[PDB]
Write a protein that binds this ligand. Structure first.
Ligand SMILES: CCC[C@H](CC)Oc1ccc(C(=O)OC)cc1NC(=O)c1nnn(-c2cc(OC)ccc2OC)c1C
Ligand SMILES: CCC[C@H](CC)Oc1ccc(C(=O)OC)cc1NC(=O)c1nnn(-c2cc(OC)ccc2OC)c1C
Lengths: 293, 288
């Protein structure tokens, strides 16, 4: 810990603080979410059916009393069986994104940036910081993202563990979990993703790139000061590689998402703004940035 | 063979059953589902731990929603399924009220004896219908798209067969009764002269004797006589066991209601909570 500059210490101290105050590990305040109800365009339909089959999951909504609802998704047959859990996942991604917005809103280096670069940075890193947070609740053995009450469990396939790791996002979660990262390396990862200066729309490239660098320098140091075991050799460069891969996956799933919205509109109002004057077009985002935490 | 009157007796009952029993439960809509004085509270917790089951809802999409019941905590949790079973009971009671009306023998009775017979026969007729959807292998009442599965209680069939009502369903299902024999049981149960509030005792007793003789005669005629020699008596004993079970669960319901009111308005009438004035809903249902 001392091996880190007092500036670095305070930097991990602020990031971890913002994570605790803005990340709901228990999803306890995740409420009012929708649940599954109790030719050229046809080629587009065929593409979407492959996207959704990779991320087929069952939803286990546990209850304080001890009860457990479990939804087994319908097997694909015709149309819209596939879009059954989509209204829910949209509600849950918005709840996730709102905490990512609040994470950044608490960080000093982010709070001082021009509001149009706060909007643009969050637009580029919303998925990446979401997936990084989801990884912390991912159970590699069960194949479940354990989100407090709700648990999303990967549906068993015929291809087995081999068929799953074909999906880049499922592979990303399994590889990143394998690294057994500390909370500090996750929040530092989330900050290197957030402060990416090459995102579309960022106009303070220098300030953001200078900030990103010091986040990676703090990450390389923390790994040097708190991780001397041989399994963690090249852990930093492994982490940095994964972040580059998450940017690749972020791009893949910005395309899958837009295609689904084209076929079957499902996006919440805020999610439509992620996918589109900056302040004017992103009215809900601008509002939330201005609000307190 | 059966007398032509007896044949017509069965014909009417089977007709009533066909018009008033939704075997797929396809019209059981809008039911409440599980969301997501110290003496009375513990007695109630004892009552509710005997018949724990897991609701399963199956969608047209092929999705399955499964409600595992909440492990007993003796609190608000224990009453999680009551708001639902209260809606199931009402839906079932309304179909039982309707069964009785289709029967000419019941419509002729005085409107006050109709209320009394239904008051004492509603539970029995409900459980008789539930048995026709009971799957003894899977321990599940298959109510069309809803399935209620008796949850393993760690004692296997031993603990369940202890509970007189689960024993009843298993025992009755082993009798492999016909649809005609099920509906005749309902009549024999409905037209019971010893029920509280009856005034035409001889009229009802005579009617129940004619339904029972039809059932006795049906078995002799339409079943290998030597093997099913005592089947009619087996049935009569179960109707009797059901009258005893009716009372136990009529008390469980009153105890569970005083601690926490789950009852729908029609159920409250059924449990005593002029006679035609004390049961105004049920009266309306009988004259519409
Ligand atoms: C359970 C949580 C983790 C798990 C990882 C496999 O997740 C799913 C499970 C199953 C499905 C699914 O098959 O049901 C359609 C979909 C998702 N995952 C998103 O639904 C999703 N994850 N991130 N984002 C997203 C969020 C943004 O704001 C933060 C911005 C852009 C985004 O781009 C896709 C979404 C819509
Ligand atoms: C559909 C499932 C069949 C299975 C057979 C035993 O049933 C249950 C399973 C589980 C439970 C349970 O887990 O408990 C919350 C409760 C019941 N069963 C009643 O809830 C119930 N069944 N019949 N009646 C009733 C009806 C009346 O008029 C029609 C009048 C009085 C009645 O009761 C005294 C009730 C309240």
């Amino acid at each position: 810990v001392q091996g880190l500059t007092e500036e670095q210490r305070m930097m991990i101290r602020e990031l971890m603080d913002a994570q605790m105050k803005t990340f709901d590990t228990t999803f306890s305040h995740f409420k009012n979410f929708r649940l599954p109800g109790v030719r050229e365009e046809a080629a587009k339909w065929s593409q979407v059916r492959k996207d959704l089959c990779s991320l087929k999951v069952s939803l286990q909504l546990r209850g304080e009393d001890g009860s457990v609802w479990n939804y087994k998704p319908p097997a694909d047959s015709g149309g819209k069986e596939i879009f059954s859990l989509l209204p829910h996942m949209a509600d849950m991604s918005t709840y996730m994104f709102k905490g990512i917005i609040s994470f950044a809103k608490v960080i000093s280096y982010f709070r001082d940036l021009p509001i149009e670069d706060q909007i643009s940075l969050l637009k580029g890193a919303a998925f990446e910081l979401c997936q990084l947070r989801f990884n912390t609740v991912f159970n590699a053995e069960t194949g479940t993202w354990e989100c407090g009450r709700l648990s999303y469990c990967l549906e068993d396939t015929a291809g087995g563990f081999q068929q799953l790791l074909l999906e880049p996002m499922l592979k990303f979660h399994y590889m990143l979990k394998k690294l057994q990262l500390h909370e500090e390396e996750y929040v530092l990862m989330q900050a290197i993703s957030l402060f990416s200066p090459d995102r579309p729309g960022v106009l303070q490239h220098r300030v953001v790139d200078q900030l990103q660098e010091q986040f990676a320098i703090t990450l390389k140091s923390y790994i040097e000061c708190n991780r001397p075991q041989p399994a963690h050799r090249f852990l930093f460069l492994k982490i940095m590689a994964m972040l580059t891969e998450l940017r690749s996956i972020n791009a893949q799933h910005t395309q899958r998402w837009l295609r689904i919205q084209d076929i079957h509109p499902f996006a919440t109002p805020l999610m439509q703004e992620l996918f589109g004057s900056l302040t004017e077009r992103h009215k809900i985002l601008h509002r939330l940035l201005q609000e307190g935490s």
